[PDB]
């Protein structure tokens, strides 16, 4: 769900997930996808493209189990969809941390309706 | 559009609109409505209910003209829909400023998918 997604992003980046990534760019947080704005945004593009196959689970609401073991996100889920969902969230969390170097605060509270359409997944 | 709306909220409250009201509560900013969580959220519940009386104007994208005169938002505006929309945005801006006294930061980046459903407008 959004709870696990948020903890993962916090754990990886060390930043408040809802505040930095809840409305970042044309892809991250609320809503769907659009043309990415930078690498941080492109992380979430893939993240949502990754969500697309889970038809599945509710990526926002369905909870799942995972562990923070030696500063590594370990998905511990039986249930195919939830396991895939957890791996989606793990990936984006990692990607977000790797691209902290180009995090732009000007995209933090982006107005998404004015985003250009995204390429299909 | 979101630009005039955000400017209004800034002018009345003195606060960053996207940051304070972009994802506040179950009703402020992105998405639809849910059960209000305080007075400030309820100011956006009304705001979104007000959008539903419009006649084909786009509340998120359509620009309109307004003036900041004697510290009052004065909707100019030709085009009747745009004017009602301007009045809708003006209302919530004032309402948001009037209810700054009970603004709760813990609702700032609220997780809206877990909000309980709103009544019909
Ligand atoms: O963005 C923050 O970290 C806190 C911001 C804030 C600014 C003004 C009043 C309350 C909170």
UniProtKB/Swiss-Prot annotation, chains A, B:
Q: A GO CC term?
A: extracellular region
Q: Where is this region: Important for membrane-damaging activities in eukaryotes and bacteria?
A: 105-117
Q: Where is this site: Hydrophobic membrane-disruption site (MDiS)?
A: 111, 114
Q: Quick one: where is this thing mainly located?
A: secreted
PROSITE patterns per UniProt? PA2_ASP (PS00119), PA2_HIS (PS00118)
Q: Which SUPFAM superfamilies does the UniProt entry name for this protein?
A: Phospholipase A2, PLA2 (SSF48619)
Q: What family is this? A: Belongs to the phospholipase A2 family. Group II subfamily. K49 sub-subfamily.
Tell me, in a sentence or two, what this protein's role is: Snake venom phospholipase A2 (PLA2) that lacks enzymatic activity. Is myotoxic and displays edema-inducing activity. Displays bactericidal activity and promotes the blockage of the neuromuscular contraction of the chick biventer cervicis muscle. Also disrupts artificial membranes, and provokes tissue damages characterized by edema, necrosis and inflammation. May act as pro-inflammatory mediators, inducing metalloproteinase and cytokine production from the inflammatory and satellite cells.
Which PANTHER family does the record match to this protein? PHOSPHOLIPASE A2 FAMILY MEMBER (PTHR11716), PHOSPHOLIPASE A2, MEMBRANE ASSOCIATED (PTHR11716:SF9)
Q: What is the protein name for this chain?
A: Basic phospholipase A2 homolog BnSP-7
- Record lineage: Eukaryota, Metazoa, Chordata, Craniata, Vertebrata
